[PDB]
Write a protein that binds this ligand. Sequence first.
Ligand SMILES: Nc1ncnc2c1ncn2[C@@H]1O[C@H](COP(=O)(O)OP(=O)(O)OP(=O)(O)O)[C@@H](O)[C@H]1O
Ligand SMILES: Nc1ncnc2c1ncn2[C@@H]1O[C@H](COP(=O)(O)OP(=O)(O)OP(=O)(O)O)[C@@H](O)[C@H]1O
Lengths: 719, 719
Amino acid sequence: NIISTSVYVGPNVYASIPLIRLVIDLNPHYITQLASMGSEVLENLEKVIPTLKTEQDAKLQHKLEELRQAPQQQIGELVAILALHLQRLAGQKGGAAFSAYCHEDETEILYSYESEEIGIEAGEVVCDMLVALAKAHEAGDQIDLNRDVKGFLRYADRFALGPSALALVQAAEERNIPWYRLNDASLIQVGQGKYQKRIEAALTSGTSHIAVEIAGDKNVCNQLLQDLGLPVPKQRVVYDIDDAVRAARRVGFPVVLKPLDGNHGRGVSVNLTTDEAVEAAFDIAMSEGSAVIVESMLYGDDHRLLVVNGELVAAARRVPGHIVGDGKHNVEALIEIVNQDPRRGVGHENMLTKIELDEQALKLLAEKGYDKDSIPAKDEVVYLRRTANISTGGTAIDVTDTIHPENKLMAERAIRAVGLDIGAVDFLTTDITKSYRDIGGGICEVNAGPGLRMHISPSEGPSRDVGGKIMDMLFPQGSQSRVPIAAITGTNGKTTCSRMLAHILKMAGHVVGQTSTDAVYIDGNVTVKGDMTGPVSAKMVLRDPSVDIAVLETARGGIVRSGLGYQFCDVGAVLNVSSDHLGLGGVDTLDGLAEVKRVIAEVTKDTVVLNADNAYTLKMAGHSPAKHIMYVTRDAENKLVREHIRLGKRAVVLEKGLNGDQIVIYENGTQIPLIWTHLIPATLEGKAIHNVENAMFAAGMAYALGKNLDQIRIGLRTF
Amino acid sequence: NIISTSVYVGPNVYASIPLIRLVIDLNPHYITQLASMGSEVLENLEKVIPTLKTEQDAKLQHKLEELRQAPQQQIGELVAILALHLQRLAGQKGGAAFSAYCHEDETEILYSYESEEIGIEAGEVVCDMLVALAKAHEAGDQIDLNRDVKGFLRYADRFALGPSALALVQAAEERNIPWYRLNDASLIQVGQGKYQKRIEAALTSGTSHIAVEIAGDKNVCNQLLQDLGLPVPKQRVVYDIDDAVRAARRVGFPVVLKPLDGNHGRGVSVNLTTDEAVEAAFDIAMSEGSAVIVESMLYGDDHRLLVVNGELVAAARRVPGHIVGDGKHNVEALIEIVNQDPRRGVGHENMLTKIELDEQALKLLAEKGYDKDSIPAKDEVVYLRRTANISTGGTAIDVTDTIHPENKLMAERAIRAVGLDIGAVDFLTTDITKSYRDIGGGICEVNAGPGLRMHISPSEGPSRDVGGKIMDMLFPQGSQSRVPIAAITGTNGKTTCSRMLAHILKMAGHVVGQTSTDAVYIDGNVTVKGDMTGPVSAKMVLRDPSVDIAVLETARGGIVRSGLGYQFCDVGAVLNVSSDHLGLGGVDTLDGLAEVKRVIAEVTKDTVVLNADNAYTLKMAGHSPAKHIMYVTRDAENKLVREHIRLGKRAVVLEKGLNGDQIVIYENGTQIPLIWTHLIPATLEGKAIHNVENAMFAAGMAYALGKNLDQIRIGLRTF
Ligand SMILES: Nc1ncnc2c1ncn2[C@@H]1O[C@H](COP(=O)(O)OP(=O)(O)OP(=O)(O)O)[C@@H](O)[C@H]1O
Ligand SMILES: Nc1ncnc2c1ncn2[C@@H]1O[C@H](COP(=O)(O)OP(=O)(O)OP(=O)(O)O)[C@@H](O)[C@H]1O
């Protein structure tokens, strides 16, 4: 039903938001189609996309669809209402949607959603559901619409960060810091230039290539681990199968044949104690033809000790699925019983696997002497899995709190020898609460950068905030700057005010960047110039690993089409944007332009500097979250000084006196003269209009950014 | 000829050194075989292993083989003389060799060589050359012996660090810091625990896994590079060949088909401007079936800008081999002429390739209209290579000094966006001295971690110390500790003196490690115990990334078999080692034991603490490089106080007085009482002998390591 698309990357319309433009082909629309579309249009939506429920918490700012059924669907608005909930079904985040009806026979839906990759399409599924339902033979809910829904969800998953990365994303958001998808797939960037880090789940910018390659190199790790005195099996001396038999003789006959390379499943042979057992196993386990290492067998369960900043933050005991007898039920009946655990299944909530008597389970129960219908002795255990897994597993039943301090220390040491920040040592033991002295080669692998899917939200015991523990050593409370100060002016004197502010901040000693449609400027030089519509100039400054302050300087053309390239700022300014000429088209008087200028004022949180001589800019003070206002006036006689400063607010006032033409910053109970117009090259020799307000605004911006007077006067005089 | 082997890892015999034990099967040895063995035995050695030359600089401490010919070869000694030179031929480093003749009919060769992997075997080749020559029909030099030599050299190369790593090794040695082969192959560790880094040529511990994976990911790099505003071709939008033709249409028809994945050679199609040209090229260039990316063609030569710590340290212009006409010679004749360049060939010195009119060259000369026998116009150029290479190339003719500052800046920015410390930006341009504004997409690849074989020792222009520039940002002069203080006592009170010293250093605030045959102790805990013969206890402490001071504590059994696990120390000590019991066997009086104790005294460079009551330990002062001596005496009446301290030397003297039994450290012009024996638990309540000298020695060691008196008294009292 969709004809055209656009996206606001910034808050042109309150927050970043995609726009869907649709046309009604179904001229005899919902208002004249209620025979085949009664209450069931809503009931059908509840089943086709089962997030579209009568849930009071489902972004229900306005409870409208339940009052409309078919006669008043107002499909353009209904698509906006139903849009985003499909994305919630896919595990995506988003907000409200609104004001979809526009021109006759057309819709422009504004709906708030975090990702562009599946943007619009979610509304495609929704608008087609509503029209397709009308265009159907009273066919019910999941006519064919459930196909489109599942397809969408798969795509939404395709472009999603995995759960191990989402753990860090949520942890970043909860510490109030921004992030980006940086490398596609699961890698994100947290923070902005100068302070930012590229991180991917259990992988950080602090961990080197060498440490990771070492971690992958099992032969190297075993030697490095031995060099620490760790409790390791060592014995990595056998390549392939050493022509058979000899390979076990060299490490001791009771061996395990560990699969290597790409063997996905576990082509592992176990408990082989004779020449025949190993000779047969060697060419079975090495099913890849060249992917086996021969090690002696040690006994213990499968533990994982996840260490981040030295500290053990999580642990797991990846016990393979099994059954324990209750004294009455047989092996097969127990499987049916195990599968009644409400946490098992597929989709959301169901994080555990199911047990079936498949070939792996069958070989194991056969090894134990079972034909499936017999009854295990009470408390007898038969394993139906060889080890771990997430989809065929999901077991995670360990603790970090009862583990003997020395086992924790040996795991830390293993990680340090490699040089990793994050890893979960693969540790085998019969008793994790005893020291390593009784654990026969418990450390087997360093396991660098484990999926957190195996630690977060465990099957037993308390959970641990693995996401937060990782973020704590990346963006600690000990370092408060994660972002540059956002200090952005409006669609104004981007070629003069901007120079004065950049000079102030550079002379102050900050690295400052801006792009006044010209090549992007970082400190003393530039790169790319162009149609700086918003997101380009912003990422070119914000992601540049040098910048302390982001000024950017916006433009009206960019904003009306894309919004801002950033979502909010701390500091900003609005100077007059109207003149008797073309602005944005439309009205270009007070109106039209009022909407573009408010984009900066309403997103500024601390100090917005407003032009006090513009009666139609003054109104921004009634909307902006910023409270200082810093009214700037070229008229010493005004009301917004005495009825403003006197009440604790700020202003920049041009006045004449002992200091010639001077610009004075007023604040609460005092006032301090800063510059002469007579001394600023931008304003010639004084007695001039052009760039006087630009100098006043640069000073106002400087106030907000930490005026110390002396370096500001230098920056203002510099030009 | 070799029967048995052993190796000293430390200076049991002056420096670390392998030992070869050989037997003479050739009873009618060299002295009775001169008819078939005249001057030519030496002349033959000069040709079989052509490092065995009459070179005055060839470790020629003693010019002996030239005076011996056959009648006095003294083969056990001659093998020691000739050994190591084979290793020099392989590009290996080593020293002197000596004292090979031992028991009748047997040899024990001591020869100094850096690696164990090809140790002994080099002497195997040599001892067999000498015997095999005698056992031959006056057969000359390279009978079959040259086979064994070439085999050896190939093995020596197999276990060698590559030239790009050797660049860092030599740079590390020239800054006086130790290193180890850590990960086999080319990776080394420079420095010791607490200060050490794992580095591999153009790869350091400071560069993360994420930065390297990004560098390898060409699609990601092009987007990250575009986000900086770099002069890049971008256009990484085509997967495979996009079903043919369309792929070029999408980027512009004038395209280059760049090979991907494992394509070793250059399956690149160029200058394709039509539908037919690209359709044909697409299935030719993608010879792997799935390894092509389609990009538009940009013009320029192949430049590499190697950046390490921001700074451009080297550059190369990898101009493919070509010929330029001189107005007289044809293409084929010019090839013969080019190949007369003395730098071209194989082996040592010959670092450039040779030109042949092979298929690559032939296609290129055919494209230019040549049949090989025609004459190019003067200064006309025909390329006989598509690009670069080391073995089929070796061209490196750029500079770093004339490159326009902005091209250097764009290369730095490319490296930073990825997050690498080291890389050589792959930059295309027609003129590197002009800014990027005129270079049509010059940055193509980040090229992380390049072989230095393409930058070090260039074919034209000045060389640059790429090795040193890398070491400068790893082990800068701004950080002087690269190693722990080596503070090692002799085969003494390893269970008491050692505790007192460890307590002193821990109470002082240093992390100290030691292994008194017991489990290795690092700070407050331990791991592995065992036959601590030298190298194990040393690497267990020295490579442990926490330790500031390495005490170790040695033992006589370990030293007589392996030497020390370290090569030298700053501080050390010798207490009495003899008693009326078994020591090392042999003599066990003054002798036998004198040789094991001198191992510590003679490798101590600053302060060695000697026992002044032992007339047969005093003699160590005449051999040790250490000059303070710190004579320790339990007898207030001695001569080695008044004739020692008075002359500027140090001592620890036990004396009786106002402070009961006290231990006083004397130094040059003063003396300061430190402890009472009455207050040290090790010495009971005073009026005791056991551990008094151990306390005195711990205090002597503390002196050398920075006594501040107060934390030393605490460490001495602690026990
Ligand atoms: N000496 C040993 N004794 C007992 N079991 C061993 C021994 N060596 C290896 N194993 C088993 O082999 C398993 C290795 O499985 P594999 O490496 O294929 O799993 P994966 O899915 O690749 O994950 P990971 O590498 O983290 O184990 C260990 O988890 C352990 O159960
Ligand atoms: N747009 C282009 N215009 C001209 N030549 C190009 C273009 N893109 C790639 N090339 C050529 O393709 C070459 C790439 O060769 P290839 O990547 O196979 O070499 P390599 O041996 O793997 O080393 P490297 O990756 O460092 O280039 C570049 O060196 C350059 O000569």
